[PDB]
Amino acid sequence: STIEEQAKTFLDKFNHEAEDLFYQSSLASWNYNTNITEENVQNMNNAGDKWSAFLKEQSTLAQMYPLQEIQNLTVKLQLQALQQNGSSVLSEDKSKRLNTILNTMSTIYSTGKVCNPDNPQECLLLEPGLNEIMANSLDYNERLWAWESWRSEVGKQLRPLYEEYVVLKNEMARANHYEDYGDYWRGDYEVNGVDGYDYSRGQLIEDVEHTFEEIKPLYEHLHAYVRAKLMNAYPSYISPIGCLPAHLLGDMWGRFWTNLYSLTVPFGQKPNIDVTDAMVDQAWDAQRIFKEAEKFFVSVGLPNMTQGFWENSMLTDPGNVQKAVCHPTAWDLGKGDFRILMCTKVTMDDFLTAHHEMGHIQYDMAYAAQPFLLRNGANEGFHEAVGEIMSLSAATPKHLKSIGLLSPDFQEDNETEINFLLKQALTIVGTLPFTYMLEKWRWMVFKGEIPKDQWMKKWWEMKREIVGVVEPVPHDETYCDPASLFHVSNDYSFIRYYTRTLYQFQFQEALCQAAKHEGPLHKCDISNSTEAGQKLFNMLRLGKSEPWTLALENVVGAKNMNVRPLLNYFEPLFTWLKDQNKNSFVGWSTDWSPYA
Amino acid sequence: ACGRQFCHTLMPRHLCA
């Protein structure tokens, strides 16, 4: 047999086993999250250990087939994926210690609990306890206690483990010939050896940096307006030319500013436009919410959900007889088996959340047409973006009027649109500077540009210069404020929230063109456009078979992330924000501190 | 890391395993 004939025999034998072992691991994982029991955890851990043991074994054996000696492209793409999924370069000791540090960091973040100085029994977990305070409170010194305690109790437990994690991840990446762990992550977006569609890891830094420059005038104006507003709402505490204190931004980190809507509303005199009331008045339950999300995808030409979907999904909180993990989450288990786990409540938020999650399911179902190792979105940014364009169309007045949640004669005026856009901006453009800077700091840690003795010094310097946000109290190198966020302490890349945000508005604009939308991009609803669904479908089914550069090009007509469709979405708000700021200082001191 | 993902929510690394 040729090497190329031995490679087919190896893949055919690998895929048969993978199909079985992945379904065993996915099904056991779902069963635990739906019903937390000792039996379910044993099953999940074993099924997981077998899957993993099998995949590292098969990744070693794939090196017997030089990829260059493979005419057939689909077996090469697979053998490459299978070569990339291997984990047998790091020493046994360091590999075991690295796992141990991942579990420890994961556990101290999930077990993180802080107790009040004013109450030694007022101990408060992060969810729902400290998140409650950090979403809702208007109490500076209460917000400050939750912010500071979280970082100085949980964060300080992470600093040592995070130093040991950095050195051990850098060893594995360099052992694979990557410059560092951050370079290894930028690997997700690498396209090498496809003429026309190639993309490097440094290309990614430049394109983030370049698109961020174009986003900055909008963030600056959003920042100055949100500040002028936070002044009225904290009159002693906020400088008109300074960064916003980190503890006042509507969550534990300022990752999103969504919860500042009530303080920042451009026209608070316009009534609430939440359709939760109509859902209650029309007696909507979880079935109806998911049944209405199903209809939206059929309107664009995509399939109905499966019998298995309706028979196996868990769309309501099971009660106390059965214990479940209530994070909204779409599952692709293998072997035709798709599901959603969601403790759905009759609210507009959950209605939107369902379209996002069912988006993930549409993606999974389309790329079932690909071989196993290519059942993956074109890059880590794609799934999130496919989710978000769904809620983009569903949240529109046009769509709500069409499904009866908004009266046929709802009157959309500039005030309603500016309110809509300001809300979207707090959530979407707010998170961009946060998301950029956070990854920038890790890129630099891993690269070796930031010494451990200057980790927190540079962290807050970058927060002040890029995010325009300042710490309320000084932090020494005893803290690991970054590790105080789930993604940092649980070893997940974060630039995906930057890329998906540009990809989503590129997607929306292209699909709204196919659907012959008329005016403002923000008003568009792809519902009823089979043409728009086709354009989506064609990328969706590709999975990770083509370069993400091509996949994007198919839908939008361009080979790279582009910021213009995003700036285009919020152009009306930008013009209004600039007029509201015509007397405000736009920009921020990098030195002013609440403790200065 | 794992060939492909069976969900699109990032879960804590402790149940992982």
Ligand SMILES: *CCC(=O)N1CN(C(=O)CC*)CN(C(=O)CC*)C1
């Ligand atoms: C092979 C994938 C895997 O085992 N994991 C990633 N993951 C998911 O695919 C579900 C979203 C989370 N995992 C768990 O099952 C939690 C331990 C691990």
